[PDB]
Design a protein around this ligand. Structure first.
Ligand code: CYC
Ligand code: CYC
Ligand code: CYC
Ligand code: CYC
Ligand code: CYC
Ligand code: CYC
Ligand code: CYC
Ligand code: CYC
Ligand code: CYC
Ligand code: CYC
Ligand code: CYC
Lengths: 246, 172, 162, 172, 162, 172
């Protein structure tokens, strides 16, 4: 009697009963377990950053130098500037410009002016300009002074024409005095590798080009290589997608 | 980048000849029907957050695997990166729609996204799926004859579909 | 991440110098206090389910309209997804207790929190109330200094949301 | 970069779970051994010039060819490179000893160092020998029990040694 | 402010040369679209009280809980400042209609929106649905080019809120 | 920048002597009671957004013209900047409280803030009243013995009050 009170008989043999049980019995808890299970391909928070070489560069803090800097803010600023601007190249104590540092310490020139002077120094020339073609010089200028790889061939054409017509000093001033440098860094911020994140207006290829230019936290833009500091992006810039074999 | 006019000009220049009557007529027709193109681009720009929201909802319902911990779009930052990528691709498709040529799309936007996503480890196939989801969610807004003069815009629907499909096929 | 150890190592590296006595003092303090923070982490991990469920219920109580049909909170999936989100937050609070710094919180939750909440119409006030309830209950669970460290991390997350 | 705590946290997040009880025990034990590790770091950092100079003396007495004209340490410039490379490696090994996790080495110190030394013509075998020599010279300073309370630290000696061998094998 | 001719002047002053043909004709198009712009601004202007009251009541209708006591919406002063807020949005939409550019909008409301909203816990949904009500009303008040152009600024502010 | 310890060190250096045992006693007393100072500054940091929102509500309740068109904080952007300013100065007051010295606040900004607000047209006495309101809102949380160990902290209240007072006066 009690069994029949339950309801009218349902025909036996439904193939959907296994799905009915899953849908019915605590769908919320099963849903939570489904949600919080691990994914098939395990990726940590910094998986992309470590598959790229530049994990540590992104994690690196931004450095700023305002007017009433006491001592070690200045000492750290100098090391950060010399490490980034000179492309992680070794700078011996003889080559270090003491007068520019004195001007910076007094505050006559901002950090941006000091960067400009370093770019016009003899170390910057002797390493990046005098030993490389103009393409490599433009790429190094972009990567160091602006923190990003070149976006297209128009940049190379414009900068090569500007150099040939107005000199190295004007070539460098076009970088530092540009609106882009003042937007991203401004006067008081040491430049950093900002191309690893998406930069407003960048090309699809800029990230890949900066990857080509980076070469690890250890690696540097010496010109002491057996190759002799040749350019890296000669064919990537003018023919972005395609590959050719002569 | 090029619009349609600049592309026709470049081809006429490579042939070293003036613009023919036929090409002038095609460009005049494009100009006369460019008003509907403006409306289509306005539809894309006014409803961008809605398109992204629909695409992301349907993608992560379709693929619980991404948002799921350990997956790609999990850590609550990579999710914002995903939404930003949807933003960028939709923006570039809108640019290519206004221009009339896919030059902005395949030049500024998607030359290296294949290898960028392979380097960052993201699954490009899910990105292409997301792009075509954006296509579907955008067509309903593009067709919407609400508050807009009724006409025929089959060519514009085809153009927008082709641009979204080009983006998906390139990134895939 | 951003622990005490990792922040020390990064700031020394940026200056290109070894670790002098100050950073070692900070590391010593961190190692001395690891015991209370790990105690708080184990207490939170023990009372995991209760905290999650109470937080969800508190959110519903302060946000009744969210339970109305045809709306964001209604639905078994959205209940489960609320539970999942609060579980994520509590997980990362325990992570920050263990790492003795707001490393995991900043890395996972806070980084990009604002625009993803905007792109999903998730009111931050829901999670603010959930974290307020978790703070209230961990006041009961934890006594002494584990209480202080926990409350620091919950309050940091609350500040990030608010 | 990752210490042991962040490493365990990353694994736990990958599993999508909290930290197991055994893992909490391990991390509490690690933080209990914190003061031993701090003295080891102090021994490395305080005696850094001594370790570097001793290792340099032994290295160049071993390989007299490096300092010959035409060798890869000949002028003062690349000898300063010698000393400064060794300084950086000791720096990062002390870092990894403090953090307990060898991640700082792999991320920063040894990131592109193979490619650097292979492009520069630097004999990587000599750099590996220099780092192993640095290991042997720094174990003396870690084992120095003067001015510290005595206590067994074989785990810390093994940790520093394996970090030095990691650096060597990643260079060699 | 950044209006069409203002964009022309600003972009040209960056380079040495004067205003060449393209920006002259852009200013042209702006001028011959000004007449619809100004008359649609007049149309949207003649209805301050009706539009603001209707949008206020629509917001209260879709979100009835704010009108309940203990919520930030409850209060005669709160309703009065709701009215002034919607009047502010309306006047700045009118400004943008006159200026043929979103200049006044981005100057007055968009600039520093989210920080203020989080400061006073105001919800962008309230204002976005009020703007949707204005969408509806302008659907009748305006015809053709006037209607489309005004709807552009209205839903641009809508996107800004969202 | 300076704190109480470095202030004492600098004055001793200026007089050129060794540190006096009396000044050593004051510094030891500061280090003993500095645990209370940590609770104070942690209260400030945790309650910061509530404190600044309280300050804004009280100001705009007592003052009206800053709301109306033509008022200094009228446009939505300008009052966003107003909130930013008040939270910034609260942060610097937290710095001063932690350090025990006012230098890091005064020498950093207060020399130029007065003239900046003068040129900008910002009513400075209103900013001082905002500082006072935010000071009382902070005092509400700083007298709060709840959820912490119980003790006497009137001297820390005096120091926080004098920091806020000095900031308000220097803005004026
Ligand atoms: C430049 C243009 C401008 C905008 C956009 C603006 C928005 C705005 N609304 C505010 C207050 C407010 N406004 C509201 C109204 C909200 N609650 C009601 O129910 C509605 C749903 C909703 C309005 C649509 C409320 C509740 C407050 C909180 C202040 C209080 O507690 O009394 C405030 C803080 C100070 C004040 O006005 O009293 C701003 C800045 N103010 C401006 O000067
Ligand atoms: C102008 C054209 C252009 C685009 C579009 C572009 C995309 C781009 N995506 C990136 C990362 C990313 N992109 C995504 C999104 C993908 N992964 C998920 O599976 C989603 C399904 C999918 C989105 C549809 C994610 C999750 C990351 C983070 C990868 C990581 O951190 O490991 C990055 C690295 C910078 C950053 O993380 O913010 C870029 C530059 N770059 C460009 O120059
Ligand atoms: C462009 C050419 C140039 C000049 C003219 C110059 C002078 C000069 N001396 C300075 C500091 C100084 N200069 C001196 C030297 C003076 N004080 C003592 O009485 C000495 C007897 C006397 C030496 C003639 C001292 C002691 C300081 C340190 C002041 C301080 O740190 O507060 C500073 C500020 C920080 C610095 O640059 O190191 C400048 C600019 N520096 C330059 O690069
Ligand atoms: C400082 C060392 C250095 C030099 C000199 C150099 C040459 C150089 N020639 C270029 C293009 C060019 N080069 C040439 C010249 C050739 N094509 C003609 O048929 C002639 C037969 C022939 C000249 C006798 C032309 C016509 C272009 C333009 C191609 C273009 O703009 O795409 C470019 C790239 C775009 C540009 O600069 O405008 C470079 C960089 N690169 C360097 O790093
Ligand atoms: C600044 C922003 C702006 C835009 C975008 C704009 C577009 C625009 N659309 C117009 C009418 C129109 N608009 C459309 C397009 C629509 N009809 C179809 O059914 C589709 C549903 C839809 C496009 C997908 C069509 C077909 C016309 C009539 C012209 C024709 O016969 O093709 C007109 C002529 C007069 C008018 O109605 O306003 C303009 C100027 N005007 C502007 O000031
Ligand atoms: C790494 C850490 C992490 C966090 C913090 C996180 C939060 C988070 N919750 C989400 C979904 C959601 N979250 C909520 C909010 C909850 N549901 C309601 O019951 C409550 C009122 C409320 C909490 C108190 C809702 C309703 C959704 C569904 C959104 C949708 O699909 O429309 C989403 C969108 C992804 C998806 O569609 O599944 C994120 C990113 N995700 C993460 O990976
Ligand atoms: C090509 C440029 C160049 C120079 C100039 C140069 C000098 C030089 N001499 C050195 C060693 C040395 N040089 C000396 C010479 C000093 N003690 C003597 O009694 C004199 C008082 C005095 C010489 C005037 C000594 C004793 C050492 C061994 C130091 C040691 O191993 O502890 C070293 C360290 C590495 C080595 O040679 O073992 C250098 C770099 N090396 C170079 O590659
Ligand atoms: C991640 C931290 C970091 C590391 C690890 C590092 C190693 C490093 N060593 C370098 C140069 C060098 N390093 C050495 C050192 C070796 N040669 C062997 O014979 C000796 C065993 C040993 C000498 C001490 C030498 C010889 C050079 C070549 C310098 C030159 O040729 O001008 C360079 C290239 C600098 C340049 O191009 O001027 C790097 C990047 N740099 C860094 O920023
Ligand atoms: C901020 C700078 C700083 C440091 C670095 C520091 C180290 C330090 N060493 C300690 C004891 C100790 N120190 C050591 C380490 C040494 N013992 C020898 O046997 C080993 C050769 C060597 C380690 C490789 C050991 C083993 C203990 C006792 C702990 C134990 O046995 O478990 C203690 C605990 C208090 C004590 O019992 O003396 C500290 C805090 N204190 C500081 O304020
Ligand atoms: C980090 C240290 C620092 C401080 C302290 C600082 C103060 C400061 N506040 C400013 C703007 C402002 N400041 C205020 C606030 C005042 N007006 C009223 O609302 C209130 C009575 C009162 C605040 C309680 C306002 C409304 C503006 C906007 C005026 C404008 O942008 O022209 C400006 C002009 C530049 C700008 O911020 O956009 C400065 C320099 N700047 C700094 O870099
Ligand atoms: C993780 C960061 C951190 C914090 C926050 C911290 C606070 C802290 N507060 C303490 C006690 C205390 N805390 C306070 C301060 C509070 N008492 C009330 O009366 C005042 C209203 C209020 C001041 C705002 C006082 C007065 C004591 C007692 C100190 C004594 O015995 O003299 C203690 C001593 C041990 C204990 O009580 O368990 C610590 C370590 N320590 C830390 O490492």
């Amino acid at each position: 009697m009690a069994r029949r009170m339950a309801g009218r008989p349902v025909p036996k043999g439904n193939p959907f009963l296994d799905m009915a049980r899953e849908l019915t019995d605590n769908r919320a808890l099963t849903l939570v377990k489904e949600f919080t299970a691990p994914s098939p391909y395990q990726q940590t928070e910094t998986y992309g950053q470590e598959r790229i070489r530049a994990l540590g560069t992104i994690e690196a803090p931004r450095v700023t130098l305002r007017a009433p800097f006491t001592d070690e803010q200045f000492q750290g600023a100098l090391y950060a500037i010399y490490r980034h601007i000179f492309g992680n190249t070794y700078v011996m104590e003889s080559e270090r410009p003491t007068t520019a540092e004195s001007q910076l310490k007094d505050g006559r020139i901002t950090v941006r002016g000091f960067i400009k002077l370093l770019a016009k120094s003899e170390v910057y020339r002797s390493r990046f300009f005098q030993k490389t073609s103009q393409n490599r010089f433009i790429e190094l200028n972009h990567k160091l002074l602006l923190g990003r790889a070149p976006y297209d061939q128009a940049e190379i054409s414009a900068h090569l024409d500007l150099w040939n017509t107005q000199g190295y000093d004007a070539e460098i001033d076009s970088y530092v005095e540009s609106e882009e440098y003042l937007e991203n860094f401004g006067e008081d911020v040491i430049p950093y590798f900002r191309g690893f994140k998406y930069q407003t207006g960048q090309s699809a290829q800029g990230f890949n080009r900066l990857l080509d230019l980076y070469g690890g936290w250890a690696g540097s833009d010496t010109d002491r290589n057996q190759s002799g500091q040749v350019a890296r992006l000669t064919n990537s810039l003018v023919r972005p997608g395609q590959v050719v074999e002569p | 980048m090029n619009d349609v006019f600049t592309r026709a000009i470049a081809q006429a220049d490579l042939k070293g000849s003036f613009l023919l009557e036929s090409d002038l007529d095609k460009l005049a027709s494009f100009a006369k029907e460019g008003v509907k193109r403006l409306d289509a681009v306005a539809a894309l720009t006014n409803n961008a957050p809605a398109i992204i929201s629909d695409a992301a909802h349907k993608l992560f319902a379709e693929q619980q695997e991404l948002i799921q911990p350990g997956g790609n779009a999990y850590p609550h930052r990579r999710m914002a990166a995903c939404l930003r990528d949807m933003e960028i691709i939709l923006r570039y498709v809108s640019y290519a729609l206004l221009a009339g040529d896919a030059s902005v799309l395949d030049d500024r936007c998607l030359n290296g996204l294949r290898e960028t996503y392979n380097a960052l480890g993201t699954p490009t196939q899910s990105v292409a799926r997301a792009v075509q989801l954006m296509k579907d969610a955008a067509m309903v807004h593009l067709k919407s004859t609400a508050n807009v003069t009724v006409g025929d815009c089959s060519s514009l629907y085809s153009e927008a579909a082709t641009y979204f499909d080009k983006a998906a096929a390139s990134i895939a | 991440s951003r622990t005490v150890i990792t922040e020390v190592i990064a700031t020394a590296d940026s200056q290109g110098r070894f670790l002098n006595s100050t950073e070692l003092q900070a590391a010593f303090g961190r190692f001395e206090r690891a015991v209370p923070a790990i105690e708080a982490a184990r207490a939170l991990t023990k009372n995991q389910d209760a905290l999650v469920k109470g937080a969800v219920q508190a959110v519903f109580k302060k946000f009744p309209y969210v339970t109305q049909p045809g709306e964001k909170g209604y639905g078994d999936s959205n209940q489960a997804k609320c539970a999942r989100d609060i579980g994520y937050y509590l997980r990362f609070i325990t992570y920050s207790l263990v790492a003795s710094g707001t490393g995991p919180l900043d890395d996972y939750v806070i980084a990009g929190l604002r625009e993803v909440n905007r792109a999903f119409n998730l009111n931050p006030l829901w999670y603010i109330e959930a974290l307020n309830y978790i703070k209230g209950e961990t006041g009961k669970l934890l006594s002494g200094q584990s209480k202080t460290e926990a409350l620091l991390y919950i309050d940091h997350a609350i500040n990030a949301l608010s």
